[PDB]
Amino acid sequence: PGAPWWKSAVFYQVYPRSFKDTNGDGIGDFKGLTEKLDYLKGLGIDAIWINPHYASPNTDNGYDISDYREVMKEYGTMEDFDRLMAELKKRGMRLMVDVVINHSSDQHEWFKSSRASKDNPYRDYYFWRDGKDGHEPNNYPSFFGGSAWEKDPVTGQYYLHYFGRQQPDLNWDTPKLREELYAMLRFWLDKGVSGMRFDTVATYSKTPGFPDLTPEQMKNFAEAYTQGPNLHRYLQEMHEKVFDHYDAVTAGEIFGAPLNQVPLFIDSRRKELDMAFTFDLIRYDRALDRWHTIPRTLADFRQTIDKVDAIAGEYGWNTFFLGNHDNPRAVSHFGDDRPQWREASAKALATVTLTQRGTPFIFQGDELGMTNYPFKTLQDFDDIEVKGFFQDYVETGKATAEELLTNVALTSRDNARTPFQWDDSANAGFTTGKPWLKVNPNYTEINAAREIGDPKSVYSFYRNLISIRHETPALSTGSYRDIDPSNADVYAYTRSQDGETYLVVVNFKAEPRSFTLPDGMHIAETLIESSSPAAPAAGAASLELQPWQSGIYKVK
């Protein structure tokens, strides 16, 4: 039997708002993305996942949808969307769209109807509840600041919003609402979309009665929000009424759930989702408050990967990524972005990304080695999440504005949202106008035009790794074995399939290091290396590594 196309595909994530502007308003759009499909095809990309592209007031840049069947005005028209799909198809590429159905915008007609009175047909499309003891229904906090309950004087009741106040949570306990969501998914699937990524998929089911979270639960309320008693029943119902009738791949952003529960979402036999986006690795060094960083080592990094790979088991499947639109830049976060180590470490991280067991997702700009942005003031951030941290921590006196800036500069989602750096023209060729978010001044040294023309660039390395992965089945669907989970200097593992075994060795130190192959194992051939002055000799039982050197070898 063969493995589904998605298990061996290499995905690229495009945050439209920041990819390519073609009309000078400072915001990326569909025409811009369509104009760059040859660029993506040339890198070797099989499929693209685009962030929300629907009608939205943009309080959470696309994640607050006011009409699920209309395109976002800033990105273009439905015609532009249809052309994007037609052009991807001409190139044999597939599209994965973002599905945001844990909540809608408060400007969605369902909510405008719902909030108008206590007795209308849409009242239960959301959660409305009486306050208690003079305040909110319970102690639930919002990820974006303050309480997760907002009072509406029209009826005197509060509505639930785990995220922004303008993102009321949809009520999955209402069958008519579930059916409306299913019809909506069919609208897009009928257009030919090849994949759907389910935004905060683990929070759909709410706890009956809304009791207060205990003091312990309050510490990590994100986890309690993924413990709704009807979650899997709803996901299985969605698969039965929708996905069982199409051949689209589904992936879930499983935010907040304990890793041990992940199999329930992805075991193929359960007929729920196909792939998992987990946060254990990308948030492995993030404090519970989400804006401070905790020092970790490569031992923590690889041990987390080992735990995540183990939960996919036999019937599950993981996506793998080191960056996305909600986290700091890969090279800054996991590598060393200083001028002298940025390219070397970005290449090392590329080797890791493209040799993990699972479907890799490359975030726009990481193939160039883009870095975090040098924020100078709190006003340099656009993200509603930072305004939420200001509300919860600075206005409350828990931290100073200076402390928030210092710390959130290293963790903010905005680090990943600065405009893609195409070349060294005005605003790195992203726009002819004024970018919605400032372009990183390092675009003069980090830009696609320059990378493409240099065989020694980060871009060229990614391109070469993608080709290698495409020609080596073991590198996608092969088994995974960490040679030494306790080693905090050099990351080494094997990928094996049908008697073929490959060894990946990556030095995470900016100093020379040595690596001794497992007893009986010997280098047979060197497929590729980064930052190496010479490949090992056939038969070698050890390797000498330069700072940040990475390599993939066929062993015997």
Please state the residue numbers annotated as binding site for Ca(2+): 21, 23, 25, 27, 29
Q: Tokens 């709190």 label which residue?
A: 378
Taking CB under 5 A as the criterion, the residue among 25, 124, 423, 482 binding Ca ion is 25
Determine the 3-state secondary structure of 53 from DSSP: coil
Q: Which residues are annotated as a binding site?
A: 21, 23, 25, 27, 29
- The nearer residue to Ca ion, 80 or 169, going by C-beta atoms, is 80
Contact region with Ca ion (CB under 5 A), list: 15-23, 235-243, 290-298, 521-529: 15-23
**Other beta carbons within 10 Å of 165:** 19
Q: How far is the CB of 16 from Ca ion (least distance, A)?
A: 9
Q: Is residue 46 a contact point for Ca ion (CB under 5 A)?
A: no
Q: Is residue 23 a contact point for Ca ion (CB under 5 A)?
A: yes
Q: Is residue 465 a contact point for Ca ion (CB under 5 A)?
A: no
Q: Tokens 């009986």 label which residue?
A: 520
Taking CB under 5 A as the criterion, the residue among 11, 17, 19, 21 binding Ca ion is 21
What string marks each residue from 63 to 82 as x (binds Ca ion by CB under 5 A) or -? --------------------
- The nearer residue to Ca ion, 219 or 434, going by C-beta atoms, is 434
Q: How far is the CB of 55 from Ca ion (least distance, A)?
A: 16
The residues annotated as belonging to the active site are 199, 253
Burial classification of residue 275, based on how many CB atoms lie within 10 Å of its CB (0-12 exposed, 13-18 middle, 19 or more buried): buried
Q: Is residue 29 a contact point for Ca ion (CB under 5 A)?
A: yes
Q: Is residue 84 a contact point for Ca ion (CB under 5 A)?
A: no
506/491 Cα distance (integer angstroms): 5
Strand intervals (E) in 26-152 = 47-50, 54-55, 67-71, 94-99, 128-129, 149-152
Contact region with Ca ion (CB under 5 A), list: 21-29, 179-187, 198-206, 507-515: 21-29
Burial classification of residue 175, based on how many CB atoms lie within 10 Å of its CB (0-12 exposed, 13-18 middle, 19 or more buried): exposed
- The nearer residue to Ca ion, 277 or 420, going by C-beta atoms, is 420
**Closest alpha carbon to 476 in 1, 5, 96:** 5
Q: Is residue 35 a contact point for Ca ion (CB under 5 A)?
A: no
Per the CB < 8 A criterion, the answer to whether 316 and 431 are in contact is: no
Distances (CA, A) of 389 to 146, 285, 394, 406: 9, 18, 7, 13
- The nearer residue to Ca ion, 73 or 233, going by C-beta atoms, is 73
Q: Is residue 236 a contact point for Ca ion (CB under 5 A)?
A: no
Distances (CA, A) of 175 to 101, 170, 234, 242, 374: 14, 12, 10, 15, 48
- The nearer residue to Ca ion, 20 or 161, going by C-beta atoms, is 20
Q: End-to-end alpha-carbon separation of the chain, Å?
A: 26
Contact region with Ca ion (CB under 5 A), list: 13-21, 85-93, 347-355, 397-405: 13-21
Q: How far is the CB of 512 from Ca ion (least distance, A)?
A: 48
- The nearer residue to Ca ion, 227 or 432, going by C-beta atoms, is 432
The sign of the dihedral angle between the CA atoms of 416, 422, 423, 424 is negative
Q: How far is the CB of 14 from Ca ion (least distance, A)?
A: 14
Taking CB under 5 A as the criterion, the residue among 9, 14, 27, 213 binding Ca ion is 27
Residue at shortest CB range from Ca ion? 29
Residue 100 amino acid letter: V
Point out which residues bind Ca ion (CB under 5 A). 21, 23, 25, 27, 29
